[PDB]
Design an enzyme around this catalytic site. Structure first.
Site, mmCIF file in Angstrom:
data_model
loop_
_atom_site.group_PDB
_atom_site.id
_atom_site.type_symbol
_atom_site.label_atom_id
_atom_site.label_comp_id
_atom_site.label_asym_id
_atom_site.label_seq_id
_atom_site.Cartn_x
_atom_site.Cartn_y
_atom_site.Cartn_z
ATOM 1 N N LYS A 1 105.447 93.573 16.246
ATOM 2 C CA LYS A 1 105.129 94.754 16.899
ATOM 3 C C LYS A 1 103.855 95.718 15.853
ATOM 4 O O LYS A 1 104.164 96.636 15.589
ATOM 5 C CB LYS A 1 106.186 95.436 17.451
ATOM 6 C CG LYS A 1 105.660 96.896 18.329
ATOM 7 C CD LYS A 1 105.643 96.600 19.851
ATOM 8 C CE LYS A 1 105.072 97.862 20.302
ATOM 9 N NZ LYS A 1 104.791 97.506 21.778
ATOM 10 N N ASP B 1 116.870 84.252 22.970
ATOM 11 C CA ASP B 1 117.752 84.466 24.098
ATOM 12 C C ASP B 1 117.055 84.444 25.308
ATOM 13 O O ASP B 1 117.342 83.675 26.246
ATOM 14 C CB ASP B 1 118.458 85.815 23.987
ATOM 15 C CG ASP B 1 119.877 85.730 23.648
ATOM 16 O OD1 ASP B 1 120.372 84.756 22.770
ATOM 17 O OD2 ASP B 1 120.772 86.583 24.167
ATOM 18 N N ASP C 1 106.899 93.125 23.379
ATOM 19 C CA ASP C 1 107.069 93.689 24.811
ATOM 20 C C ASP C 1 106.509 92.466 25.575
ATOM 21 O O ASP C 1 106.706 91.944 26.501
ATOM 22 C CB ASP C 1 106.808 94.906 24.740
ATOM 23 C CG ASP C 1 105.309 95.399 24.104
ATOM 24 O OD1 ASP C 1 104.769 96.475 24.723
ATOM 25 O OD2 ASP C 1 104.977 94.664 23.440
ATOM 26 N N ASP D 1 115.880 87.145 17.586
ATOM 27 C CA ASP D 1 116.994 87.086 18.393
ATOM 28 C C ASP D 1 117.003 87.391 19.873
ATOM 29 O O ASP D 1 117.656 86.942 20.601
ATOM 30 C CB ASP D 1 117.663 88.330 17.813
ATOM 31 C CG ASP D 1 119.194 88.797 18.382
ATOM 32 O OD1 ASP D 1 120.074 87.897 18.699
ATOM 33 O OD2 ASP D 1 119.441 90.094 19.107
ATOM 34 N N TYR E 1 118.212 93.547 9.891
ATOM 35 C CA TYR E 1 119.685 93.258 9.729
ATOM 36 C C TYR E 1 120.314 93.544 8.405
ATOM 37 O O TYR E 1 121.511 93.798 8.606
ATOM 38 C CB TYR E 1 119.585 91.677 9.978
ATOM 39 C CG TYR E 1 119.603 91.227 11.702
ATOM 40 C CD1 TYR E 1 118.765 91.703 12.415
ATOM 41 C CD2 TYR E 1 120.617 90.323 12.011
ATOM 42 C CE1 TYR E 1 118.669 91.505 13.763
ATOM 43 C CE2 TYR E 1 120.849 90.133 13.498
ATOM 44 C CZ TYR E 1 119.941 90.546 14.286
ATOM 45 O OH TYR E 1 119.984 90.323 15.446
#
Ligand SMILES: CC(C)[C@H](C(=O)O)[C@@H](O)C(=O)O
Ligand SMILES: CC(C)[C@H](C(=O)O)[C@@H](O)C(=O)O
Ligand SMILES: [Cl-]
Ligand SMILES: [Cl-]
Ligand SMILES: [Mg+2]
Ligand SMILES: [Mg+2]
Lengths: 363, 363
Positions: free
Chosen positions: A193, A253, A225, A249, A143
């Site tokens: 990851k 959600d 994933d 993030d 970010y």
């Protein structure tokens, strides 16, 4: 002396849900004998309208003077045409997190008793319940990494972003997750990851270093994933999730939507000095603004979390949470939490805040 | 002359599901009069064991000679201790995609008729069905961007990864998604994080450029975090998803798990010359290897997709797909697709391949 809270209601349903939070807070102040002074500031679209930018310098100064910020939500169609840079969310949220060094984000989410059927999960899965606290690193990673931008032209025009993390950045967020897990069910699932990203290899390494100090906390690692799949299949098995900025993030959600009850969910963003901003996970929902039907519980719980985390007022935060629970468990529900055949009985935003405020008083 | 297929069965259940694919392919060859020659190569863990690395040079040369690759799955506990770099998946998959310039990945997923209840979604949602083709950019973005690595030491040791995309890279994958959508339901949803990432701003820009040539295809853009939520709530509303490398890894997995039927799902990885590798979306499942219960449909459908996409043998691919459908619709199911009270009637891997192969013959 007085605690000081900067109130940044923002756009859409922000002001109306904020009025209910202020109403509950006042009950709490009376019941516990608290001296709290409030100051209001513009942010997001109302700040664009009154001042030409979504994060005015005077709003930053006002937040800086306060012990914490009770924040609503920003954004709306009125501002969607603007450059990415000048818009309410990106222009206010990302600068606020960098400015105040809010490296710690925490999004608690659970299926509330009696509302498990709201979940979009199959009924045999949602009836098992879940309660998952997402700990998300908020001021590092991709970010805010540099270099970022573009060069080149035509078919060879290219953009870049850089994901960067240091051991100091990963250590501090991981400590939050393990401390949090100690007071919950003593399990941290770190999402990365590490089969692809250098940053994830270091993330996983540092989380293993931190985990040595908490041998009674189970640590597991999961790839992003697979995490999105395993949250569908077995959400009752997760306790704390520990994530970098982009992966947090995404995971927070998905979990929020798995509740089926996003109007209940709040967000903590804190720095190392305990200053924080507390706000609904959901947005400014401009489509229902001023209709007095928005669910104010997320904003009211954001105030409870402000009292617990920034002000260390544990009994006061507990009281608000008990009062909310009472409303939900007594079936005092706003419309989005009722079936279509019961939706005619929805409680308004004011009815909700009145019930909750009365419950705090009644003790 | 003969078509040439390199067969890379890999580890765990790879060889046993591959035998069923080879069995169906043979029926297809007889029915359609095809001359196909097969050659077998080691990859992943069996290649580590016989050759010291997971992607031997002779396996690369063999793939290069072939018109396409029918691939199984790689990985297992035997190899998990190794450095990230030397392991079956990362060491074979990422190098294969770079080596053969496989920039296009396509993962088709649908709820199959009669198996909607397998989905982890609430029954009122899963009974509405879904059919979502994920188009994922496979050779760019943060997977292969440079610089990547680490520097520094102690608390200031830091790692970095670079996400990079050019207009040429985004154009070619977006064209695939719009072409695919033309033959489906004429809708592309492009998934990005354009409120944060320079790469996503360019992605969204180039997809809008490409979309001018396909005005009869609806385009919408969605942020990755919201996408994970909207796939829970309304998966019947998506047709093609168009994603960068990291976001396509994540979205395709969530959708796969939303089927509840991952043993049916296959993956296409193709270059601009039509060469491709075709494999199950699911892994080597070492826990059931050699037990003859694995569901071979994903491997068999990977062969149908190899015939359609690399070999342009449309009728032959259709025949395999019809034969699979016949098995599933006649309730000829392996165990993971049956309830616990019916699971005693599971069909074995061989029974499945026999049924399907017989169906291709019967025409
Ligand atoms: C608005 C956007 C920049 C922001 C983020 O990506 O963090 C939002 O998605 C969030 O989760 O708070
Ligand atoms: C194994 C890993 C490198 C790979 C990827 O991230 O692409 C896998 O998750 C996939 O989806 O094929
Ligand atoms: Cl990140
Ligand atoms: Cl990417
Ligand atoms: Mg978000
Ligand atoms: Mg993956």
């Amino acid at each position: 002396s007085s605690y000081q809270i900067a109130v940044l209601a923002g756009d859409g349903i922000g002001p109306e849900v904020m009025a209910e939070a202020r109403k509950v807070l006042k009950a709490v102040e009376a019941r516990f004998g608290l001296n709290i002074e409030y100051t209001e500031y513009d942010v997001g679209g109302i700040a664009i309208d009154n001042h030409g930018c979504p994060l005015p310098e005077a709003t930053l100064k006002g937040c800086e003077a306060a012990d914490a910020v009770l924040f609503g939500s920003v954004g709306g169609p009125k501002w969607e045409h603007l450059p990415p840079n000048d818009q309410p969310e990106r222009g206010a949220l990302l600068p606020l997190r960098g400015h105040f060094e809010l490296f710690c984000n925490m999004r608690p989410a659970k299926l509330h008793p009696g509302l498990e059927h709201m979940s979009p999960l199959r009924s045999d899965i949602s009836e098992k319940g879940f309660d998952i606290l997402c700990v998300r690193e908020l001021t590092g990673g991709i970010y805010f990494g540099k270099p970022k931008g573009r060069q080149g032209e035509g078919e060879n025009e290219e953009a870049f972003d850089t994901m960067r993390y240091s051991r100091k950045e990963i250590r501090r967020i991981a400590k939050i997750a393990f401390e949090s897990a100690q007071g919950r069910r003593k399990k941290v699932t770190s999402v990365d990851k590490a089969n692809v990203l250098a940053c994830s290899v270091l993330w996983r390494e540092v989380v293993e270093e931190v985990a040595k100090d908490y041998p009674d906390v189970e640590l597991e690692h999961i790839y992003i994933d697979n995490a999105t799949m395993q949250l569908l299949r077995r959400p009752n098995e997760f306790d704390v999730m520990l994530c970098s900025n982009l992966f947090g993030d995404i995971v927070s959600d998905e979990i929020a939507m798995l509740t089926g009850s996003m109007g209940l969910l709040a967000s903590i963003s804190m720095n190392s000095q305990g200053f924080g901003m507390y706000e609904p996970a959901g947005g400014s929902a401009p489509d229902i603004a001023g209709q007095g039907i928005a669910n104010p519980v997320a904003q009211i719980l954001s105030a409870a979390l402000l009292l617990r985390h920034s002000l260390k007022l544990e009994d006061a935060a507990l009281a608000i949470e008990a009062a909310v629970s009472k409303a939900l468990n007594s079936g005092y529900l706003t419309g989005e939490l009722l079936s279509s055949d019961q939706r005619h009985k929805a409680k308004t935003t004011v009815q909700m805040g009145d019930f909750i405020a009365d419950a705090v008083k009644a003790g």
